[PDB]
């Protein structure tokens, strides 16, 4: 279990009890959405799987299908998302990002740039089992140019994991190479940027980006804005933010999703669901530090109804 998640395993857990109570809630005239939300947002992902199993054995109906039939709107999206395992949820979100003629590059980038090697290994495996095809093949068919190269490289999840051994010489050489490949000359050696940023460990790259400031007039993020454009630039910016401060990265994404009129629910829901058992506590801390008011407050003031209640539970409170 992650100590930085907002959703923790329920102590007095009884899958049968929850399955019985959810069944009654589903069959209540008009549905008792409150009970369904109160239960599922207060159980760990694993516990939800146990609940789904108990539910089917007792009713001969799959819980997911029962809820897709019983719920609708944004609430349905949150609840069904919470029922999928982490890998399954990410795999389905990735598949959804590449559905149709166009491609939701923003979603594809957010997911591919933020997941660890461990998470990506599972996503790749589950993706193959669910859609029968490979994740890489789909990315390749929905992207092109250097943007494709970068996304394919990242999706592989073969990033080095040089344990904890700091390589000061490589830190310096990588910083010099990133500079020589960009700001230092006319044009940009994008392949060098892709290699360094996708093959080195996160702790290493954090140190590289710091050492980079010693050679370059602008930091990594500004360097990216001056060297590349389009989806490629967007990908690099997201990637560097994820490396420098992943919790802050998500906090900014969350703020952006609610700032204006209405909310970009697709993003808001994916982050609340997917990071609820990973680093939501860190995301909350960075969000409050930067924006002043808590993430809870923004969710409260930007969504309504049972949907809002569900998201607030995933947030977990504020402190």
Please state the structural category. Answer: mainly alpha
Number of helices: 19
- The helix/strand series, from N terminus to C terminus, equals HHHHHHHHHHHHHHHHHHH
CATH superfamily placement of the largest domain? Annexin
For the termini, the CA-CA separation is 21 Å
- Principal-axis shape: elongated
Number of domains: 4
Secondary structure: number of strands: 0
Please give the share of residues in helix: over 70%
Q: What are its keywords?
A:
Annexin V, domain 1, 319 residues, mainly alpha, 19 helices
Summed up:
With 319 residues, this protein is mostly helical.
List the helices and strands and how they pair.
Layout: H1 15-26, H2 33-40, H3 45-59, H4 63-70, H5 73-83, H6 86-97, H7 105-114, H8 117-130, H9 135-142, H10 145-155, H11 168-180, H12 190-199, H13 202-215, H14 220-227, H15 230-258, H16 265-275, H17 280-291, H18 295-302, H19 305-315
InterPro entries: Annexin, Annexin_repeat, Annexin_repeat_CS, Annexin_sf, ANX2
Modified residues (Phosphotyrosine): 4, 179
GO biological process, one term: lung development
Please provide a written account of the structure.
The chain is mostly helical and 319 residues long. It folds into four domains: 1-84, Annexin V, domain 1, CATH 1.10.220.10; 85-163, Annexin (Annexin V, domain 1, Orthogonal Bundle), CATH 1.10.220.10; 165-244, Annexin (Annexin V, domain 1, Orthogonal Bundle); 246-319, Annexin (Annexin V, domain 1, Orthogonal Bundle). The protein is built from 19 helices and no strands. Helix 1 (15-26) crosses helix 3, helix 15 (230-258) packs across helix 17 (280-291) and helix 15 packs across helix 18. It is classed as calcium-binding protein. Keywords: calcium-binding protein, annexins, calcium-binding proteins, membrane-binding proteins. It forms a monomeric assembly.
């Amino acid at each position: 279990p992650s100590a930085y998640g907002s959703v923790k395993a329920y102590t007095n857990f009884d899958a049968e009890r929850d399955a019985l109570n959810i069944e009654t809630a589903i069959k209540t005239k008009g549905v008792d959405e409150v009970t369904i939300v109160n239960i599922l947002t207060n159980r760990s992902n694993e516990q939800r799987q146990d609940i789904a199993f108990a539910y089917q054995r007792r009713t001969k109906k799959e819980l997911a299908s029962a809820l897709k039939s019983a719920l609708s709107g944004h609430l349905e999206t949150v609840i069904l998302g919470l029922l999928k395992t982490p890998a399954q949820y990410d795999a389905s979100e990735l598949k959804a990002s590449m559905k149709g003629l166009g491609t939701d590059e923003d979603s594809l980038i957010e997911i591919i740039c933020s997941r660890t090697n461990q998470e990506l290994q599972e996503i790749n495996r589950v993706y193959k089992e669910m859609y029968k095809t490979d994740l890489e093949k789909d990315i390749i068919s929905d992207t092109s140019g250097d943007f494709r190269k970068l996304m394919v490289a990242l999706a592989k999840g073969r990033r080095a994991e040089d344990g904890s051994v700091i390589d000061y010489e490589l830190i310096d050489q990588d910083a010099r190479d990133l500079y020589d490949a960009g700001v230092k000359r006319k044009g940009t050696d994008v392949p060098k940027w892709i290699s360094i940023m996708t093959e080195r460990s996160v702790p290493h790259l954090q140190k590289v980006f710091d050492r980079y400031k010693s050679y370059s007039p602008y930091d990594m993020l500004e360097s990216i804005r001056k060297e590349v454009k389009g989806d490629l630039e967007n990908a690099f910016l997201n990637l560097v933010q994820c490396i420098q401060n992943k919790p802050l990265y998500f906090a900014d994404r969350l703020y952006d999703s609610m700032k204006g009129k209405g909310t970009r629910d697709k993003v808001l829901i994916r982050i609340m669901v997917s990071r609820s058992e990973v680093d939501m506590l860190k995301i909350r801390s960075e969000f409050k530090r930067k924006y002043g008011k808590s993430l809870y407050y923004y969710i409260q003031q930007d969504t309504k109804g049972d949907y809002q209640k569900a998201l607030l539970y995933l947030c977990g409170g504020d402190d």
